C-alpha cells in the first residue's frame, strides 16, 4: 500500500445554488507519495508541467487519479505539475474549480447555518494498494468581514475513513474498502440585508394594518382592508423576486402568510363587528375594543410560532 | 454474441426543465464482459485509467460504445477506467452527467407524479454481436426527506427489450434488432411550498372578494370590485414569476381563472341588482340575497371542476 | 462524381428562441456511398467507432465533411462510426445536436405557423466531385399530442438543388455548383395556454371597464377609470413577463393597446359628458347613452381590426 | 512580403448585448496567397479538410494565423480547409462564429443607429512579411424586412491600413507596422415595437394625468394624483423589465422622468391653488385656469427638450 | 535565476459580477527572457504559432507556465506564439480572457470606487530559478467617456514582490519565495443612470408623501397613507429588479427604508393627532402644525445619516 499525503488549499467558496444544492469551490490540491528512486538531470528535482505529464504516463509513470466523490460533472482543471526528486518522492500539485454538491437545509433562511463538504477518494485503487496518510487544509485566504455573504467559523475539520462497497464483492472479494478523505467547512449566512430590507418593512406593514379599526364607518374599513391586502400581495412579489428558490418555506415565507392571516382576520372581525345588528340598523362598539388586544393576540401567536 | 452485464449507480437526479422536458442525471455506469485470456504484469488485474484507454484501443482492444438513447447532446464523461483480468474478463467503469429527455405531463402541477427514464443501447453492434445479460440499478444515495423537491417512490424498474429498426433493411438484412436496457424511476413532487404560498392566499382572496355585497350603496360596490380585480391581476403576476413555464394550464392556472370568473360574476350581479329599477329610482334587495348562496354556487362549480 | 445517399432521423425539435430566430434539433445523420473494394477481417463488414476514424483518414480514407449551412456555431457531435463492406460501400452514421437558424415570422403569435429548415451541403467538393442522390427523412418519434408545444403537420419535405457561388469564379472556373439537400418540417403552435390565460381575462377586463358609465356622479367615474388604467398597466406587465421577446408587436400586444384605447376613450367621453354645461351647473344625460353603443363601437373597431 | 487576399462572407449578425457592447457575427472567411509550386496527385488541386491541416503544418507548410482584433475570447471555428493548386496558390477557407466588441452609443435608444466593425490582422507577421492586398465583403444573406430587428443600410465599407506598435521598438526596430483590414456595416434599429407599446401609452397616461383639475373638491384631486403617481411607477417598472440595461438614460427614460415631473407639478399646483386662502375658508379659481395652459406649458418643455 | 520581463496589454474590462465579486478582463500578455543561443533558418527570428509549441516543448524547450493567482477557473487562451532569436532571446506572446476575482466593497453603490487587480506568478519555479525583472502595463484602449459604465482614473500601478509559502518548508527548505507581479487599475462607477432614475423619483415620492396632513378629515388621511405605502412597496420592487444583488445594503436601500420610515411616522402622527380626544368627539389641530416641521425633522435625520 502506497501512503499518499494530501493537502488542500481552499482559495474561495461561492455561488451557492439553493435549488440544485451545489456550491462552487476554487483552490489547489497537492498529493505526495514515495516511489522508486530515479536519476534526474543533475541532482536537482525535475519539474514536469501540464502536457508533459501525458508523455510520462505513457512511459510507465504511476500517477493515481484522485476524484472528488461529490463533484457534479468534472472540475475545470487548470495548471498541474509533477515534481520528481532523485530520492524517489513525487509531488502532484493541481488546481481545480468544481461545482460540488451537499445536503443543505435552508429551512431557517436568513439566519442559516450550512457546512461545505469536500470528499476525495482514489478512483480505482482500494486501501490495500493506496491509502491516505494525513490531510492538511489551509483556508487562510477566506475572510470573515461584512462584505462576504458567508462567515467562515473556525478552521476546517478533516477525516480519513474507509468506505465499503458491497457491489465489488462479485469481482474482487476481500478487497473492496476504499480510503476516503473528508473536509467540512462551517459557514453562517450574513443576515444584514435580509433583516433590514425584508423583516422590518413587513413588520411595519403588519403593524400599520391593525389601525383600520380606528375608522368610524364600515365601508371605509372594508376598502382600506382591500388596499392593504393588495399591499401584502405586492410585498410577497417583491420578496419573491430578490430571493433564492426553494421547495420548502423559509422564515420570511412564514411572515408573509402571517401578514395574509392578519389581513383576513381583520376583514373577518370587521364583518362580524358590523354584522352584530338586530335587524340592520343597530350599531356596535363592543367587539371593536380589539384595537389594542387583537394586535397583542396575533403578536402572541407570532411569538409562540417563533418558539 | 457477447453478453454485456450493465450496472448503473444513480447518484443524483435534479434540474427538471419543464419546457424542454429534460432533467439532469449524475452517476456511474459499469459494463462487464468476457473476452480472450491475456497475460498481465504478474497475476493481478491490470488497471487502465482515462487517457490510457485510447492507447489500448489503437492496439486492437475491443471496447464497445454504449450510448444513451434519450440523452440530449453528449454526457460530460468524467473519469473512466478499464480493469482487465488474466482470466479474460474486462470491466469498463465510467462516470456520466447527462441532460436526459422524456415525455412529461405537468397537467396537475403541484400534485405531480413523474417518472424518469434512462435508455441505453449499443451504438453499432446489433443483438447478434452484443446482447445485454442483466442490469442492476443502485439508488441508495437518493433520499426521501422534506428538503428534496422530489420524493422517489420505491426502487427502479429495469427492462431488457429488442428494438427493431426497419431502415437498416437495405444495408443489413436479417440482423437489425438492437438490445436495449430501460430504467424507470418514479417520483412525486413536494407540494408543500405550492400549497402554503399559492393555494391558501388565493383561496382567501376569492373568499374575501365575495363580501362586497355587504356594502350599502352601489358606487362603493363597483369601486371595491375594481380594486379586487387589480388584486387578482397582481396575484396572477406573482404566481407567473415564481413558477415553471408550460404550454398548457396547471391547477393553479385554473384557480386564477376561477378568481377572474368570481370577480366578473360579482360585477355582473352588482350591475344587475342595481339595474332592477322601474325608471331609475327604485332600490332593490331581492337578488342581493346572494351574499350566502353565490359563494356556495361558485364553490359548487369549483368542487365540481375538481371532480 | 460520387453519389452520396443521405438519411436524416429527427429525434426532437425544441428550444425555439424567438429573438435569435434559432431552434435546437437533435437527431442522427446517415450518409452512404460506394468507393473501392477492400479486404476486411473475414468477409463481415468492419466497424470503426469514434476516435478510430482519425486513424483511418490519416491512412488515406476518403470521408467527406458534410456541413449544415444554417447551423449556428458547431453541432455537438456525439458518437459516430464508419461501416465498411468488402464490396466497397461505406456508411457514415453520426449523431448531432445543433442550434439551427431560420427566418421566422411571429407576427400572429399565439396562432403561429412556422416551418423548421435543415440545410446540408458538402464543405469542399462541388457537384462535379460529390453529388447527392436522394434523401429520406424519418420523423416517427415526434408526436402531435396536447403536451408538446408544437404540432407537427405531416411529413417532411425534402429537396435537392444546385447552389451557385460566383465568388469562386476567380479560382475555379466552370465548377462552382454545390449540391445542397433541404428539409422542411411544418409546425403549428399550441394556442391553449395563450387562449385561456391571456385572451379571456383581458377580454373580461375590457368588457368590465365599460361599466363605469353606470355610476351617478362624476368624480367616481374618474377615480374608477384611473383604477382601471392601473389594472391595464399591471396586466401589460403580467403578459410581458411570461412571453417571448420580439422586435414587432404580437396579437396580444394589439389587444393591450386596444385596452389602453378603451380606457382613454372612456376618460375622454367622461370629461366630455361632464363638460357639457352652460356655465358649470348644468347636468347631462344625452351623451351618456353610450353605455350600450360605445361598447358596440369599440367592439366593431376590434372586429374590423381582426379582419 | 506575401500578398494575402481576404474575402469575408457575413451570414448573420445578431445578439447585440448593450451592457457588454458586444454582438455576435457568424460567417466565413477566405484567405488566399501564392507560395511555392508543388506536385499534387494528378494535376487537380488537392483539398485538405479539418484535422488534416495539422498534419501538413508539421511537415512545414506555411499557414498564417489571422486573428480578429476586436473579438472577445476565441471564435468557435467550425469546419476549415486548405485547397492547394499545382501552380503554387493556396486557399484557406474557414467558418467562424464570434462575439465581437465595439464602442456603441445607445443614447437615442429606440431610434438608434449603430455600426458593426470587424477588424482583422496577422497575429505575428508584420507588413514586411505579410501584407493584405484587397478585401471583398459579401452580405447578400442579411435582409432588410420588418421581421429583422436591424435594418442594414447599404453595403459594407472596407479599409486596409497599417497600424504601428511602439512597444516592439525594443525587440524589433524598423519593422513594427502591421497590416490591418477593417469592415464596417451600418445598421438602424427597428423602432416599431418601441413606438407602439412604450411611447403611445406613456403619452396617453401623461395626457390623462392633466385632467385632475376638472374635479371640484380638493381631497379628490390629491387622492387621484397619488393614484396617478402609482400608475407612473408601475409603468416605469413595465418598461424596466422589457428593455436592455444601460449605464446612461435612453429617450424613454427621459419620458418617464417627464411623467414624474408632470405628476409632481400637478401636486404642487393643487396644493398652491388650494392654499390661496386668507385664513382657511376662502376658495379659489384663478390659478385653476391651468387646465388648458399647464398642459401646453409642459408640452412646450417637452418639445423644447426634443430640440 | 532567469530574468523574465512581462508586459500586459489590457484590452477591455467588463462584466462586473457583484455577488461572486468577479470581473472579466480581456487582453494580451508578453513575457520575454534570454536562454541559450541557437541556429535558426537563416539569421531571421523563427516564429512558432499555436500548436507548434507543443512540438518544441517535447524537444526540450524551456517555456515556463505563468499563472494568474486570482483567476477563477482557467483563462480562455486564444492564439499564442513564440519568437526565437539567433542571439538566444525568446518572446512568448499570448492572449487571454479571464474571469478574475477581487475583494470588492459595494457599500456606497451608485457612487462606488473600485480597483481591479491582476496578480501573476510562476506556477512552479521559485525566485531562485525565475524572477521577474519589470512590468509595463498598456491601457491605451480603455476610454473614459459617458458611454462606458466605469471611468478609469489614471494609469495602472504595478508591483513586484516576493511571496513566502511556509507549507513548502517540509519538501523544499531555504527556497520557497515566489516572485509575484501585481497590477491595480482604479475605476469609478458612472452614477448618471442611478441618479436620474432612482434617487430623484424616490425623493419626489417621499416629498409628496408629506402632504397628507393638508387633508381635512381623518379617514382620508389613513386611506391616502395606505395608498402611499403601496407606492413605496412598488418602488422598492422596481429598484430590486433593475439592480445588482448584494449581501449588504446600498445607499438606495437606505433610502427605501427611509421612505418606509417616513410613511410609518406619518401614520403614527395621524393616529396620535386624531386620538387626542377627551372621550371621542374633540377635534385637534395642535400636533398638525407638523406640515412644515416633520418634513424638516425627517430631512434633518436624512442629512445627518448622510454625514
Ligand atoms: C377578547 C376576546 C378573546 C377572544 C380570543 C381571540 C383568539 C382567537 C383565535 C384566533 C386564532 C388565530 C388565527 C389567526 C391566524 C394567524 C396566522 C398564523 O399565525 O398562522 C400562520 C398562518 O396561518 C393562516 O394564514 C391561516 C389562515 C387564517 C384565516 C382565518 C384566520 C382565523 C379565522 C378562523 C376562525 C375559526 C374558523 C372556524 C373553524 C374552526 C401559520 O404559518 P404557516 O401556515 O405559513 O406555516 C406552515 C409551515 O409550518 C409549513 O411547514
Ligand atoms: C337562486 C337563483 C338560482 C340561479 C342559479 C345560479 C346558477 C348560475 C350559473 C352560473 C354558471 C357559472 C358561471 C361562473 C363561471 C365560473 C368559472 C368556472 O368555474 O369555470 C372556469 C373558468 O371559467 C370562466 O372564467 C368563464 C368566464 C365567466 C364570465 C361570466 C360568468 C358567467 C356569466 C355568463 C352568464 C350567461 C351568459 C349568456 C350566454 C349563454 C373554467 O376553467 P378554465 O376555463 O380555466 O379551464 C379550462 C381547461 O380545462 C383547459 O384545458
Ligand atoms: C351615437 C354617435 C355616433 C358617433 C360615432 C362614434 C365613432 C367614433 C370613432 C372612434 C374611432 C375609434 C377610436 C378608438 C381607438 C380604439 C383603439 C383601436 O382599436 O386601434 C388600435 C389602438 O389604437 C389606439 O390606441 C389609438 C389611441 C386612441 C386614443 C384616443 C381614441 C380616440 C380619440 C380621438 C378622437 C379624434 C381626435 C381628433 C383628431 C382627428 C390600433 O392597434 P395598434 O396601433 O396596436 O396596431 C398597430 C399595428 O398594426 C402595428 O403594426
Ligand atoms: C399662466 C401663468 C404662466 C406661468 C408660467 C408657467 C411655467 C412654469 C415653469 C415650469 C418649469 C417646468 C418644470 C416641470 C418639470 C418637467 C419635467 C421635464 O420636462 O424635465 C425633465 C424631468 O425633470 C424633472 O422631473 C424635475 C423634477 C420636477 C419637480 C418639480 C417640477 C417644477 C417645480 C419646481 C418649481 C420651482 C422650484 C423653486 C426653485 C427654483 C428632464 O429630463 P431628465 O432629467 O430625465 O433628463 C436628463 C438627461 O438629459 C440626462 O442626460
Ligand atoms: C415640534 C416638536 C418637536 C418634537 C421632536 C421630533 C423628533 C422626533 C424624533 C424622531 C426620530 C426619527 C425617527 C424616524 C425614522 C426615520 C428613518 C431613518 O432616517 O432611519 C433609517 C430607517 O429607520 C427606520 O425605518 C426605523 C423605523 C421607524 C418606524 C417608526 C419611526 C419613529 C417612531 C418611533 C417613536 C419612538 C418609539 C418608542 C421607543 C423608544 C435608518 O437607515 P437603515 O436602517 O436603512 O440603515 C441601516 C444601515 O446602516 C445598515 O448597515
mmCIF file of N, CA and C in Angstrom, chain D residues 221-291:
data_model
loop_
_atom_site.group_PDB
_atom_site.id
_atom_site.type_symbol
_atom_site.label_atom_id
_atom_site.label_comp_id
_atom_site.label_asym_id
_atom_site.label_seq_id
_atom_site.Cartn_x
_atom_site.Cartn_y
_atom_site.Cartn_z
ATOM 1 N N UNK D 221 -58.716 65.628 -5.738
ATOM 2 C CA UNK D 221 -57.554 65.932 -6.562
ATOM 3 C C UNK D 221 -56.302 65.256 -6.019
ATOM 4 N N UNK D 222 -56.106 65.307 -4.705
ATOM 5 C CA UNK D 222 -54.903 64.725 -4.121
ATOM 6 C C UNK D 222 -54.918 63.206 -4.223
ATOM 7 N N UNK D 223 -56.040 62.573 -3.872
ATOM 8 C CA UNK D 223 -56.102 61.115 -3.938
ATOM 9 C C UNK D 223 -55.943 60.616 -5.371
ATOM 10 N N UNK D 224 -56.523 61.337 -6.333
ATOM 11 C CA UNK D 224 -56.358 60.962 -7.728
ATOM 12 C C UNK D 224 -54.921 61.150 -8.192
ATOM 13 N N UNK D 225 -54.243 62.192 -7.702
ATOM 14 C CA UNK D 225 -52.846 62.397 -8.067
ATOM 15 C C UNK D 225 -51.960 61.292 -7.515
ATOM 16 N N UNK D 226 -52.262 60.796 -6.319
ATOM 17 C CA UNK D 226 -51.455 59.711 -5.771
ATOM 18 C C UNK D 226 -51.697 58.404 -6.519
ATOM 19 N N UNK D 227 -52.940 58.166 -6.954
ATOM 20 C CA UNK D 227 -53.199 57.015 -7.820
ATOM 21 C C UNK D 227 -52.437 57.126 -9.139
ATOM 22 N N UNK D 228 -52.357 58.332 -9.698
ATOM 23 C CA UNK D 228 -51.623 58.506 -10.944
ATOM 24 C C UNK D 228 -50.122 58.332 -10.746
ATOM 25 N N UNK D 229 -49.602 58.722 -9.583
ATOM 26 C CA UNK D 229 -48.184 58.525 -9.321
ATOM 27 C C UNK D 229 -47.852 57.044 -9.189
ATOM 28 N N UNK D 230 -48.753 56.271 -8.577
ATOM 29 C CA UNK D 230 -48.563 54.819 -8.559
ATOM 30 C C UNK D 230 -48.643 54.235 -9.968
ATOM 31 N N UNK D 231 -49.499 54.799 -10.822
ATOM 32 C CA UNK D 231 -49.552 54.354 -12.215
ATOM 33 C C UNK D 231 -48.223 54.593 -12.925
ATOM 34 N N UNK D 232 -47.612 55.756 -12.703
ATOM 35 C CA UNK D 232 -46.350 56.059 -13.383
ATOM 36 C C UNK D 232 -45.222 55.186 -12.850
ATOM 37 N N UNK D 233 -45.255 54.842 -11.557
ATOM 38 C CA UNK D 233 -44.240 53.926 -11.028
ATOM 39 C C UNK D 233 -44.396 52.532 -11.629
ATOM 40 N N UNK D 234 -45.639 52.053 -11.744
ATOM 41 C CA UNK D 234 -45.870 50.751 -12.366
ATOM 42 C C UNK D 234 -45.475 50.754 -13.837
ATOM 43 N N UNK D 235 -45.631 51.893 -14.509
ATOM 44 C CA UNK D 235 -45.217 51.965 -15.906
ATOM 45 C C UNK D 235 -43.701 51.991 -16.043
ATOM 46 N N UNK D 236 -43.014 52.682 -15.134
ATOM 47 C CA UNK D 236 -41.555 52.680 -15.155
ATOM 48 C C UNK D 236 -41.017 51.282 -14.923
ATOM 49 N N UNK D 237 -41.686 50.516 -14.067
ATOM 50 C CA UNK D 237 -41.335 49.114 -13.890
ATOM 51 C C UNK D 237 -41.575 48.303 -15.166
ATOM 52 N N UNK D 238 -42.738 48.472 -15.796
ATOM 53 C CA UNK D 238 -43.042 47.704 -17.001
ATOM 54 C C UNK D 238 -42.037 47.984 -18.110
ATOM 55 N N UNK D 239 -41.554 49.224 -18.214
ATOM 56 C CA UNK D 239 -40.509 49.488 -19.203
ATOM 57 C C UNK D 239 -39.153 48.979 -18.735
ATOM 58 N N UNK D 240 -38.943 48.869 -17.422
ATOM 59 C CA UNK D 240 -37.640 48.429 -16.942
ATOM 60 C C UNK D 240 -37.454 46.924 -17.084
ATOM 61 N N UNK D 241 -38.560 46.200 -17.238
ATOM 62 C CA UNK D 241 -38.497 44.721 -17.391
ATOM 63 C C UNK D 241 -38.151 44.374 -18.846
ATOM 64 N N UNK D 242 -38.994 44.796 -19.793
ATOM 65 C CA UNK D 242 -38.789 44.502 -21.241
ATOM 66 C C UNK D 242 -37.905 45.578 -21.880
ATOM 67 N N UNK D 243 -36.642 45.704 -21.452
ATOM 68 C CA UNK D 243 -35.715 46.714 -22.035
ATOM 69 C C UNK D 243 -34.260 46.278 -21.821
ATOM 70 N N UNK D 244 -33.285 46.835 -22.576
ATOM 71 C CA UNK D 244 -31.875 46.476 -22.427
ATOM 72 C C UNK D 244 -31.189 47.381 -21.394
ATOM 73 N N UNK D 245 -30.431 46.803 -20.471
ATOM 74 C CA UNK D 245 -29.750 47.581 -19.449
ATOM 75 C C UNK D 245 -28.710 48.503 -20.061
ATOM 76 N N UNK D 246 -28.563 49.685 -19.480
ATOM 77 C CA UNK D 246 -27.574 50.685 -19.959
ATOM 78 C C UNK D 246 -27.049 51.475 -18.755
ATOM 79 N N UNK D 247 -25.853 52.097 -18.824
ATOM 80 C CA UNK D 247 -25.337 52.901 -17.716
ATOM 81 C C UNK D 247 -25.744 54.376 -17.869
ATOM 82 N N UNK D 248 -26.419 54.709 -18.974
ATOM 83 C CA UNK D 248 -26.901 56.086 -19.259
ATOM 84 C C UNK D 248 -28.385 56.025 -19.628
ATOM 85 N N UNK D 249 -29.086 57.154 -19.524
ATOM 86 C CA UNK D 249 -30.548 57.195 -19.807
ATOM 87 C C UNK D 249 -30.836 57.258 -21.311
ATOM 88 N N UNK D 250 -31.900 56.558 -21.729
ATOM 89 C CA UNK D 250 -32.447 56.496 -23.073
ATOM 90 C C UNK D 250 -33.406 57.658 -23.298
ATOM 91 N N UNK D 251 -34.139 57.605 -24.404
ATOM 92 C CA UNK D 251 -35.204 58.568 -24.661
ATOM 93 C C UNK D 251 -36.408 58.239 -23.782
ATOM 94 N N UNK D 252 -36.734 56.950 -23.683
ATOM 95 C CA UNK D 252 -37.865 56.517 -22.870
ATOM 96 C C UNK D 252 -37.619 56.797 -21.392
ATOM 97 N N UNK D 253 -36.370 56.757 -20.960
ATOM 98 C CA UNK D 253 -36.094 57.139 -19.586
ATOM 99 C C UNK D 253 -36.059 58.643 -19.385
ATOM 100 N N UNK D 254 -36.036 59.447 -20.449
ATOM 101 C CA UNK D 254 -36.371 60.855 -20.263
ATOM 102 C C UNK D 254 -37.874 61.036 -20.171
ATOM 103 N N UNK D 255 -38.634 60.227 -20.915
ATOM 104 C CA UNK D 255 -40.086 60.375 -20.895
ATOM 105 C C UNK D 255 -40.676 59.939 -19.560
ATOM 106 N N UNK D 256 -40.074 58.943 -18.910
ATOM 107 C CA UNK D 256 -40.564 58.526 -17.594
ATOM 108 C C UNK D 256 -40.335 59.623 -16.560
ATOM 109 N N UNK D 257 -39.168 60.264 -16.604
ATOM 110 C CA UNK D 257 -38.898 61.367 -15.687
ATOM 111 C C UNK D 257 -39.769 62.570 -16.029
ATOM 112 N N UNK D 258 -40.129 62.741 -17.303
ATOM 113 C CA UNK D 258 -41.097 63.774 -17.659
ATOM 114 C C UNK D 258 -42.467 63.467 -17.070
ATOM 115 N N UNK D 259 -42.842 62.190 -17.026
ATOM 116 C CA UNK D 259 -44.094 61.821 -16.376
ATOM 117 C C UNK D 259 -44.079 62.088 -14.883
ATOM 118 N N UNK D 260 -42.958 61.772 -14.231
ATOM 119 C CA UNK D 260 -42.806 62.096 -12.813
ATOM 120 C C UNK D 260 -42.879 63.599 -12.580
ATOM 121 N N UNK D 261 -42.258 64.375 -13.464
ATOM 122 C CA UNK D 261 -42.296 65.819 -13.319
ATOM 123 C C UNK D 261 -43.685 66.388 -13.521
ATOM 124 N N UNK D 262 -44.443 65.812 -14.451
ATOM 125 C CA UNK D 262 -45.817 66.261 -14.652
ATOM 126 C C UNK D 262 -46.691 65.945 -13.445
ATOM 127 N N UNK D 263 -46.532 64.746 -12.870
ATOM 128 C CA UNK D 263 -47.303 64.377 -11.684
ATOM 129 C C UNK D 263 -46.961 65.293 -10.512
ATOM 130 N N UNK D 264 -45.668 65.547 -10.297
ATOM 131 C CA UNK D 264 -45.288 66.368 -9.154
ATOM 132 C C UNK D 264 -45.637 67.833 -9.362
ATOM 133 N N UNK D 265 -45.584 68.332 -10.596
ATOM 134 C CA UNK D 265 -46.034 69.693 -10.841
ATOM 135 C C UNK D 265 -47.539 69.812 -10.664
ATOM 136 N N UNK D 266 -48.293 68.758 -10.991
ATOM 137 C CA UNK D 266 -49.726 68.776 -10.725
ATOM 138 C C UNK D 266 -50.014 68.801 -9.233
ATOM 139 N N UNK D 267 -49.250 68.042 -8.446
ATOM 140 C CA UNK D 267 -49.457 68.044 -6.997
ATOM 141 C C UNK D 267 -49.088 69.399 -6.405
ATOM 142 N N UNK D 268 -47.998 70.001 -6.892
ATOM 143 C CA UNK D 268 -47.599 71.325 -6.418
ATOM 144 C C UNK D 268 -48.647 72.375 -6.762
ATOM 145 N N UNK D 269 -49.179 72.331 -7.981
ATOM 146 C CA UNK D 269 -50.194 73.294 -8.380
ATOM 147 C C UNK D 269 -51.484 73.094 -7.599
ATOM 148 N N UNK D 270 -51.805 71.846 -7.255
ATOM 149 C CA UNK D 270 -53.015 71.578 -6.475
ATOM 150 C C UNK D 270 -52.878 72.148 -5.067
ATOM 151 N N UNK D 271 -51.724 71.923 -4.432
ATOM 152 C CA UNK D 271 -51.515 72.437 -3.082
ATOM 153 C C UNK D 271 -51.467 73.961 -3.085
ATOM 154 N N UNK D 272 -50.871 74.550 -4.124
ATOM 155 C CA UNK D 272 -50.803 76.010 -4.180
ATOM 156 C C UNK D 272 -52.173 76.623 -4.466
ATOM 157 N N UNK D 273 -52.969 75.995 -5.329
ATOM 158 C CA UNK D 273 -54.268 76.555 -5.666
ATOM 159 C C UNK D 273 -55.266 76.376 -4.536
ATOM 160 N N UNK D 274 -55.132 75.316 -3.741
ATOM 161 C CA UNK D 274 -55.941 75.221 -2.537
ATOM 162 C C UNK D 274 -55.462 76.201 -1.480
ATOM 163 N N UNK D 275 -54.147 76.356 -1.359
ATOM 164 C CA UNK D 275 -53.565 77.082 -0.240
ATOM 165 C C UNK D 275 -53.687 78.593 -0.373
ATOM 166 N N UNK D 276 -54.289 79.103 -1.440
ATOM 167 C CA UNK D 276 -54.567 80.532 -1.534
ATOM 168 C C UNK D 276 -55.842 80.800 -0.745
ATOM 169 N N UNK D 277 -55.686 80.961 0.572
ATOM 170 C CA UNK D 277 -56.775 81.282 1.484
ATOM 171 C C UNK D 277 -56.323 82.395 2.419
ATOM 172 N N UNK D 278 -57.276 83.218 2.863
ATOM 173 C CA UNK D 278 -56.944 84.295 3.790
ATOM 174 C C UNK D 278 -56.685 83.755 5.190
ATOM 175 N N UNK D 279 -57.556 82.868 5.672
ATOM 176 C CA UNK D 279 -57.322 82.150 6.916
ATOM 177 C C UNK D 279 -57.606 80.655 6.834
ATOM 178 N N UNK D 280 -58.280 80.180 5.791
ATOM 179 C CA UNK D 280 -58.554 78.763 5.665
ATOM 180 C C UNK D 280 -59.917 78.423 5.091
ATOM 181 N N UNK D 281 -60.736 79.441 4.826
ATOM 182 C CA UNK D 281 -62.084 79.229 4.316
ATOM 183 C C UNK D 281 -62.274 79.750 2.896
ATOM 184 N N UNK D 282 -61.373 80.588 2.393
ATOM 185 C CA UNK D 282 -61.556 81.196 1.080
ATOM 186 C C UNK D 282 -61.210 80.216 -0.030
ATOM 187 N N UNK D 283 -62.155 80.006 -0.940
ATOM 188 C CA UNK D 283 -61.955 79.120 -2.078
ATOM 189 C C UNK D 283 -61.138 79.841 -3.146
ATOM 190 N N UNK D 284 -60.843 79.156 -4.247
ATOM 191 C CA UNK D 284 -60.037 79.760 -5.293
ATOM 192 C C UNK D 284 -60.388 79.146 -6.638
ATOM 193 N N UNK D 285 -60.265 79.958 -7.688
ATOM 194 C CA UNK D 285 -60.429 79.513 -9.065
ATOM 195 C C UNK D 285 -59.346 80.042 -9.999
ATOM 196 N N UNK D 286 -58.587 81.065 -9.586
ATOM 197 C CA UNK D 286 -57.753 81.833 -10.508
ATOM 198 C C UNK D 286 -56.619 80.997 -11.087
ATOM 199 N N UNK D 287 -55.811 80.364 -10.233
ATOM 200 C CA UNK D 287 -54.717 79.527 -10.720
ATOM 201 C C UNK D 287 -55.222 78.229 -11.336
ATOM 202 N N UNK D 288 -56.513 77.919 -11.190
ATOM 203 C CA UNK D 288 -57.101 76.738 -11.802
ATOM 204 C C UNK D 288 -57.558 76.990 -13.238
ATOM 205 N N UNK D 289 -57.090 78.068 -13.858
ATOM 206 C CA UNK D 289 -57.196 78.235 -15.302
ATOM 207 C C UNK D 289 -56.116 77.468 -16.051
ATOM 208 N N UNK D 290 -55.289 76.696 -15.337
ATOM 209 C CA UNK D 290 -54.207 75.911 -15.919
ATOM 210 C C UNK D 290 -54.654 74.523 -16.360
ATOM 211 N N UNK D 291 -55.962 74.324 -16.560
ATOM 212 C CA UNK D 291 -56.448 73.107 -17.193
ATOM 213 C C UNK D 291 -56.204 73.097 -18.695
#
